[PDB]
Write a protein that binds this DNA or RNA. Structure first.
Length: 890
DNA sequence: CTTATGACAGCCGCG
DNA sequence: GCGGCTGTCATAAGA
């Protein structure tokens, strides 16, 4: 097999790399790497090395890496560019691995672990590690085994051993329902004391040292906890054994109010799963805990247990340990679904970076561009320092707040990356400046053509048109690779099924390879379909990773810490987008006025960053609503009209803009997204806007896919807000469903009924939610001080009423919290109360809270008020005989 | 982050 | 005694 790296670290003047050798064995090596860096030289001197500006550069080889750094500082002090890859780990990887890295995941130790720490006095802080580690479940991907470490004796109890037998049994049998898939894979180790467990774990760690170390919240908790626990007990020198190179950096990151401890374990790649999810699932989840995410992804979640976690070990050690086994397994299941680790390995090996740098677009892009330019003997720029200077961003239109009966939306694809390639934006491609007219002038073609020589963005910038820019080239390359790998994708995935359906690879091979294959087999047709499906697996991941690069380019480009950052270019990109969405609002409005025989009608009712929303009202009126045999008939009509009449007019429009800005190539393409409207022959309103980023739509067709039942596309509204009570999210969604599909009378009936039935709803279902941030800041001795927000006052009411019970769950800084208003004259002595979320409120006050809460204020605050928002905008009433003069701001 | 809106505190001015 | 309006805060929604 072809050699590939596992981890890389620079320590002093050495690279410490762990890598898989040519056979497949994991080994480690220490190289005294000699980096090269580059300086500008006379045109007299001949090299093969040029900077991206075409200026010639001397390659300077250094005896070691400390000579290189000291040269850079010394070159900085003189005032001359010191160019080339300043991060030597990367430059090393580029040197040692000058080929397309093929990697065998089978030879990469991916560790999955979670610990348990019984704490009777609140959250066990990792940087303290006050309390003993009583359970460690560590999953190893090579042995494919769950190594379970069980503390039998601790200050908090002596417990029996965990039973594998009981664990397997059903819930109703007294069992833990530990999945049969893992029962023969658990390896169990009880211990008599914490010292033995920890040292056996550490000795386990040296034998089976992780390459990729993952698991839920491991980077914020499990890892610092273990390190500090071992540090504090055995000495720092023992805790450092947790690194295959015995070097650890202790880092304290700062927040929006506080800080956090992270431990860098040199020679290991920490890919916390809570980060691998946030990064590459793309789903704005309301809670990022493992219970939720696991329920979401697997509909199974974490193991249930009676009582507080802090009393679990003594009351039910059996549940406790299995709880810890399932936790790890849950994580492994999610990854069996999403493949986020393999995604990371693929990206990390593609860009040739440390795998943990996948969370950095800057690092990933820098390397991709570095390797690319190195291959053509080019030299990258020195990272220049830059003042963080806000520039203009995405355009969003003010919508006139209204009901909107028929809407079609359109989206420019990859707007920003597309703009880069279209205008040819790149540091070295900057041609010059032109006088800037107001943006609206360029938007209306009224302005003077900026240049007939150079490619242009309406921010005043001019770019070389002939040249191939670094940035535009490197992104085009990724676009191409995307198409390519989606090519093998839609081949092994598409042509593959021909082999599968017959039983009853990158390109669909000639009808001689497909011909000589027709003999029904158990060794062939059904075991060679395993190949075609495993091939498309590779297609997906390669394509997802290209998509991820494409979208995370502007972010890197807009970051002052990026080698290729340039404020005028960032501003060029976004300003160009700003004109492009609005130029096409003009072009669509003009086309639709011509076609409809109207003049000066606002068809585009909303536009946001890369997409427009278009009223289809008059287009329907042209046919007249009455010629459609059903809903699906007009959805057909509008779809055809879009693809046939509207999109060529859109393309004609953008082609005109391209000639106007004099761009290198025309890459402004709009797909048609949603088609929305009411069900035929109904009183529904279809859709409505209340303002920027707030709207609901009744959608029948999202780009191609024609839905069975209609589905609500709701954006920004209270339904989409975790702060909204469970019951109330539900009702407002219904309120909206009823508004759009059924009409005003439906809504009024629903409103009346819910209002009538409010007090019979669960108190948890009707309590609002919010995060507890800056709890101290407004805590004036347990009472609310100046400027104190409503929910924190709510907490400081719970506290005073609760200061004295240890059984009572304390409210912690950071924690999400149920809030409830309280009726005047309440014992609790305040306008509201708040308690920890996802929990029933303690019996000590519960029955008295349920008595004092203000239903009127609650319903008004969380339901009626935001409803009034929707109905006001949609020109509807949620109850009869509402005087129409309310509409006016007298 | 940049684009946002909305809940709520607290100012100022209002015979 | 509330509008009007600025500032903290919470949270989308796509990067």
């Amino acid at each position: 097999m072809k050699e590939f790296y596992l981890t890389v670290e620079q320590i002093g003047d050495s690279i410490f790399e762990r890598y898989i050798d040519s056979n497949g064995r994991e080994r480690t090596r220490e190289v005294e790497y000699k980096p090269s860096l580059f300086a500008h030289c006379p045109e007299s001197q001949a090299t093969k090395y040029f900077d991206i500006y075409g200026k010639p550069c001397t390659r300077k080889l250094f005896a070691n890496m400390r000579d290189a750094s000291q040269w850079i500082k010394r070159m900085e002090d003189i005032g001359l560019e010191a160019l080339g890859m300043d991060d030597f780990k990367l430059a090393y990887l580029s040197d040692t691995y000058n080929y397309e890295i093929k990697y065998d995941h089978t030879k990469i130790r991916v560790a999955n672990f979670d610990i348990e720490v019984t704490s009777p006095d609140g959250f066990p802080e990792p940087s303290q590690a006050k309390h003993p580690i009583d359970a460690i479940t560590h999953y190893d991907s090579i042995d494919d085994r769950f190594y379970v470490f069980d503390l039998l004796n601790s200050p908090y109890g002596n417990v029996e051993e965990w039973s594998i037998e009981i664990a397997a049994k059903l819930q109703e049998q007294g069992g833990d329902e530990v999945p049969s898939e893992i029962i023969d894979k658990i390896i169990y180790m009880p211990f008599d004391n914490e010292k033995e467990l920890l040292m056996e774990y550490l000795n386990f760690w040296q034998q089976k040292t992780p390459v990729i170390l993952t698991g839920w919240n491991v980077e914020s908790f499990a890892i610092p906890y273990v390190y500090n626990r071992i540090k504090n007990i055995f000495g720092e020198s023992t805790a450092k054994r947790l690194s295959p190179h015995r070097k650890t950096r202790v880092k304290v990151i700062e927040n929006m109010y506080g800080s956090r401890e992270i431990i860098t374990l040199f020679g290991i790649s920490v890919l916390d799963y809570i980060d691998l999810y946030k990064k590459f699932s793309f789903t704005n989840q309301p809670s990022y805990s493992l219970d939720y995410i696991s329920e979401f992804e697997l509909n199974v979640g974490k193991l249930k247990y009676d009582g507080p976690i802090s009393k679990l070990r003594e009351s039910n050690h059996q549940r406790y340990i299995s709880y810890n086994i399932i936790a790890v397994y849950r994580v492994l299941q999610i990854d069996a679904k999403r493949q986020f680790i393999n995604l990371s390995l693929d990206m990390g090996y593609y860009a040739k970076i440390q795998i943990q740098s996948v969370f950095s677009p800057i690092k990933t892009w820098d390397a991709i561009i570095f390797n690319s330019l190195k291959e053509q003997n080019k030299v990258i720029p020195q990272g220049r320092s830059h003042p963080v200077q806000p520039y203009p961003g995405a355009f969003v239109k003010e919508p006139i707040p209204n009901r909107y009966k028929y809407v079609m939306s359109f989206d420019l694809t990859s707007l920003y990356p597309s703009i880069i390639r279209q205008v040819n934006i790149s540091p070295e491609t900057i041609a010059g400046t032109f006088k800037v007219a107001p943006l609206h002038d360029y938007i209306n073609a009224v302005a003077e053509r900026p240049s007939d020589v150079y490619s242009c963005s309406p921010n005043g910038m001019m770019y070389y048109k002939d040249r191939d820019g670094v940035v535009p080239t490197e992104i085009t390359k990724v676009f191409n690779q995307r198409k390519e790998h989606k090519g093998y994708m839609l081949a092994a995935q598409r042509n593959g099924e021909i082999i599968k359906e017959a039983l009853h690879y990158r390109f669909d091979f000639s009808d001689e390879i497909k011909e000589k294959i027709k003999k029904l087999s158990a060794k062939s047709l059904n075991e060679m379909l395993f190949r075609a499906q495993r091939t498309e697996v590779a297609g997906m991941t390669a394509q997802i990773n290209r998509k991820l690069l494409i979208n995370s380019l502007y972010g890197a480009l807009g970051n002052v810490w990026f080698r290729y950052y340039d404020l005028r270019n960032a501003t060029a990109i976004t300003t160009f987008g700003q004109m492009a969405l609005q130029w096409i609002e003009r072009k669509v409005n003009e086309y639709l006025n011509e076609v409809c025989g109207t003049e000066g009608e606002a068809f585009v009712l909303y536009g946001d960053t890369d997409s427009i929303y278009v009223s289809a009202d008059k287009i329907i009126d042209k046919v007249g609503e009455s010629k459609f045999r059903d809903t699906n008939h007009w959805v057909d009509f509008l779809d055809k009209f879009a693809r046939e009449r509207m999109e060529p007019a859109i393309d004609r429009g953008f082609r005109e803009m391209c000639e106007y800005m004099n761009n290198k190539q025309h890459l402004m393409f709009m797909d048609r997204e949603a088609i929305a409207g009411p069900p035929l022959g109904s009183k529904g309103i279809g859709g409505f806007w209340t303002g920027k980023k707030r709207y609901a739509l009744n959608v029948w067709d999202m780009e191609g896919t024609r839905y069975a039942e209609p589905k609500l596309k709701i954006m920004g509204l209270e339904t989409q807000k975790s702060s909204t009570p469970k019951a109330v999210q539900k009702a407002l969604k219904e309120c909206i469903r009823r508004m759009l599909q059924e009409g005003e009378e439906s809504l009024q009936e629903y409103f009346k009924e819910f209002e009538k039935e409010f007090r019979q709803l669960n108190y948890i279902s009707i309590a609002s939610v919010s995060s507890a941030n800056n709890i101290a800041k407004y805590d004036v001795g347990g009472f609310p001080g100046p400027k104190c927000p409503f929910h924190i006052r709510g907490i400081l009411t719970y506290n005073r009423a609760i200061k004295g019970n240890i059984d009572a769950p304390q409210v912690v800084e950071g924690e999400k919290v149920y809030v409830l208003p309280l009726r005047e004259g309440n014992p609790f002595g305040d306008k509201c109360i708040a308690w920890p979320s996802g929990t029933e409120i303690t019996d000590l006050i519960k029955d008295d809270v349920l008595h004092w809460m203000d239903y009127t204020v609650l319903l008004e605050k969380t339901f009626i008020k935001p409803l009034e928002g929707f109905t006001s905008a949609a020109k509807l009433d949620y109850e009869k005989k509402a005087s129409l003069f309310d509409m006016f701001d007298f």
